[PDB]
């Protein structure tokens, strides 16, 4: 094992990453596993009352890629309620083949798909709040390191512009984003500090001053208004004490530079922001906002996975519905309706069609097509979120 | 880069899984970096109105084994509020050393902290609710597999008997536990599964039949009762649906069991479970608890880590309290309060004495003791939630 | 501040209000080490910067007593009532201004 | 000094109704007074989620005459949210001269316009109520006597249609308002009261009857309406202890007199009144009002008052906005926004254009008008508050 409390690739891939019940009973069941192919769809028993930006198939594929195991799940951003139009229970995944060839990933499975959807959720409700307004995902700090790269990947594909992580960024294939850190002011002073990142910002990237470190926000802006000229952003990180009504303090400041004629000095906020704060905010003046806590620790969809047919026969157990089905979906006011495998598409009157989402992706273990780049799946994750406001 | 969405030991140890601000800044800085030592602490900015169970820290020093700073924490398994007697913000860990050299490490650092201590700590409220009766960890499927074994860990050290995953175990250095799942019910059926079961489990460990995959409770226990003899417990994973009054269900099943003069057949609950769930159900009757999401989805604490001091001189930000500091509690009530870094120790009336807590683990790089494995930190923190009730 | 000090004689105890321009924490220290013969510190901090004034109010307290100035006491003004006198003097206040 | 625990029009203009900072720190200054010019503007920090009926401006021109003072301010009557359509504070009158000549003057200029805003304010919310119905304001027996004709003056201003207090009366150029007291059939009994109230109340004025000193108000309607004819108005000051349903009561009552075809007769209700209890009573039925404590009480608006501009050049503390400002409003839907003090006029598209309220009432201490008399005053508050529904 490795140096961490983590569990490396080899090990998920093994399936040493899951609850040992599985193999003592694949172990107990013998040569009974020749005779056992069934049928898994994992459904959200998850919070019911809102919508979901579903995201993390990815990983499963890359887990069940090389199985003899047909897969069928809905697109990564597609963005839809786990209750359909009659309350029926939406499954995002199924799963074929021999239970004992890939039961033992079920706890992986729902890992991959649990977390990663609550961030991605998060994620685009503060986009709809930011609105025409950028944000960026800067919460890796408060969640393990080892899943740095999977948060501000989800974080995006939610809405946000730009992550803060380097293997966020990498994956998602964009530069990293970042401002000078408090740290900066502590030990070169303000003026230093606002001197040197000056300095080591470019065009091609926006300039960007952390003015919170010493001064109160207001005389901060106003000296930085005349004391530099090619400053195109102010950003507020104002402590939590410091905070009595963080959006009459950005009138306030927001009114001081356009005073002086700097009105060209943006305003950037940070520091346990919601989609409620963000909205306030950028109604106060904000036009860009880090947000990182409330996204990266974004509680878990509760997505559990069970057997919904054994032997070509419907069977499942108490709570659940039996069965294979298809998630079909009008395609214009995207009324969604859960039905029987055997129904690929149902006729309606109101617009359009309505067709199959729960899509195939493994074909006895083989890719179906290409996988799309986490840009491409953010960007059909905005269509989406379109339908919710 | 590897597989699946995850940084490995070898990128965090790299500085990889960080803000890409702290490494561009380092860059900016310089020579000055050679004229630059100065002291972080961490401080939880987080939920004040809780104690914390302090974890995570073994990570931490895994991560600066090595390089020339000086460490000094708080001990794992550690129990108190984030703010001292007299409303001071608590230091669970001090880094010192040559800023450029350990400053890409601050996002890996507070990652290892934050998430791990909100899990350890809800472990130990569920500790207190369990009382005399065991609970295990078992939600390591709703977060990625890649944490898998620093949640059970954290699980154990708060509180929990046993754990689920694979990985964990071996990490705490104990046996996975496990139960048939609901899954070899709906393969085989229930007498086939009971049977399965009790013939694949030998004393060293206790017998356990999941009850609830197809009849109501209440005839599954009465069946079960006249059907076999040898079994230690009676699980029920009753469905959300299914569970209109839990406590009451459990009663009657507790009756009828006895009436059959069976009620040596014990009763084990599972399925959202709380500290107030675990509570209420184990004064209807149950003596043994499934825990999971509650455990693994526990909230991270909100621990921020900033500059103290610099080259010697006392030196923070507005909102953070400057200067080195020491951890002093009473050794009888553990009263706390936090003091500059220059007092050992203080004189009380109360009961016993006041010795510091914020202890070196890590003198230039080494460390400076035998670190303890989790069952002596468990071992520790069941000793300090004695004072929490 | 200076006019301050110069304007106020034993009889009665010498008072400066620290909040229109600076950080109540750095206007504190700047004090602190400027200044020898005061008693007193006023805050008057405004609504809008007044998230946790008893947080603020530790904070300043601590870094005081740091320099070894805790000889400096703190007195508060502004939007105060019963309720709010009891906790800022829980957390370290010792003289209060009420007026509306 | 005087008698009661007043401070005399002498007192106030020589500067001692104030706090003694001012004269100590003007003392201080010395020398350098010649030196100090500045600008001084009075927002509210007060309510912010509440209109505003600006009043007491009167007062404050009475002071500063004779002084070399410039003063801007918004008119009387004017009505307002505290903040601008941006969330700007909005400045109500701005005083400028030489800090030491009126600095002194602070305490009671901030005297003038709080109490008597908040009273004009509450009585415009009490005018709506009203809708048709008459109110008037009898509470200046819950205040000191001393302002006794301010509290009245405000009221009206505010929306009242009469005034109890004989100096308020007086002041705004209205007959005193009045109905026996209570008293009267405490000592003739009700029959004398009665026909004494009716023998001194000729054409000119209304005839109101008392009717809750003995009986029940049901039997007193009746026995009134079967023994005189000449009655306009009953009224009820019915004890809060018998005001089980003063709807429902005053329901029954106008059916017993419909009913013996007395309802010529109308009822007057009074006694702890709202712009709440108003709507309500006269929805069951009340075609007249009197207002008193709810009034008179009304908390006063948090004015406060501060440097914004030194010498000709903007500046101000943490919490102000620096600079002269104008206060500029839609003439058509009313919109306002504040903006620095060289901007006169802005081009909008709405409806008809947007021009400063912010108008100067003393150049150099002399009166740039004449002022309103307070029917003229109200009558703008009236046409104003058709803006608030
Ligand atoms: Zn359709
Ligand atoms: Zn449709
Ligand atoms: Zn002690
Ligand atoms: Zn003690
Ligand atoms: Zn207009
Ligand atoms: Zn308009």
């Known amino acids: 094992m490795n140096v961490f409390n983590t569990a490396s690739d080899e090990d998920i891939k093994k399936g040493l990453a899951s609850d040992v019940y599985f193999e003592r009973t694949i172990s107990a069941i013998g040569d009974k596993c020749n005779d056992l192919r069934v049928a898994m769809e994992a459904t959200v028993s998850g919070p019911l009352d809102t919508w979901i930006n579903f995201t993390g198939l990815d990983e499963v594929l890359k887990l069940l890629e090389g199985l003899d195991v047909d897969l069928y799940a809905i697109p990564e951003g597609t963005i839809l309620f786990p209750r359909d139009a009659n309350g029926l229970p939406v499954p995002f995944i199924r799963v074929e083949g021999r239970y004992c060839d890939f039961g033992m990933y079920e706890t992986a499975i729902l890992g991959f798909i649990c977390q990663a959807s609550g961030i991605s959720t998060k994620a685009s409700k503060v986009r709809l709040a930011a609105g025409d307004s950028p944000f960026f995902s800067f919460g890796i700090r408060r969640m393990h390191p080892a899943i740095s790269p999977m948060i501000d990947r989800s974080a995006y594909i939610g809405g946000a512009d730009g992550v803060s992580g380097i293997l966020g960024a990498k994956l998602i294939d964009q530069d990293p984003v970042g401002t000078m850190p408090h740290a900066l002011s502590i030990m070169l002073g303000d003026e230093e500090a606002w001197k040197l990142t000056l300095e080591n910002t470019k065009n091609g990237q926006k300039s960007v001053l952390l003015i919170d470190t010493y001064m109160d926000e207001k005389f901060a802006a106003i000296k930085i208004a005349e004391m530099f000229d090619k400053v195109d952003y102010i950003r507020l990180d104002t402590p939590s004490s410091r905070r009595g009504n963080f959006e009459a303090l950005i009138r306030e400041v927001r009114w001081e530079l356009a005073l002086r004629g700097r009105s060209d000095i943006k305003i950037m906020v940070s520091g346990g922001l919601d989609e409620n704060t963000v909205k306030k905010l950028r109604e106060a003046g904000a036009e860009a906002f880090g947000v990182g806590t409330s996204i990266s620790s974004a509680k878990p969809?509760?997505?559990?996975?069970?057997?919904?047919?054994?032997?070509?026969?419907?069977?499942?157990?108490?709570?659940?519905?039996?069965?294979?089905?298809?998630?079909?979906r009008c395609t214009s006011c995207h009324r969604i309706e859960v039905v029987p495998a055997n129904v690929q598409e149902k006729t309606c009157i109101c617009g359009g069609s309505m067709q199959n989402l729960?899509?195939?992706?493994?074909?006895?273990?083989?890719?179906?097509?290409?996988?799309?780049?986490?840009?491409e799946i953010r960007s059909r994750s905005m269509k989406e979120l379109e339908y919710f406001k």
Do not use: Q, W
Not at 305 to 316: L, R
Not at 358 to 375: A, D, N, Q
């Open 301 to 328: 969809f509760d997505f559990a996975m069970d057997i919904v047919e054994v032997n070509g026969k419907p069977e499942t157990k108490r709570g659940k519905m039996s069965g294979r089905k298809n998630v079909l």
């Open 358 to 375: 729960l899509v195939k992706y493994l074909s006895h273990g083989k890719r179906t097509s290409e996988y799309p780049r986490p840009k």
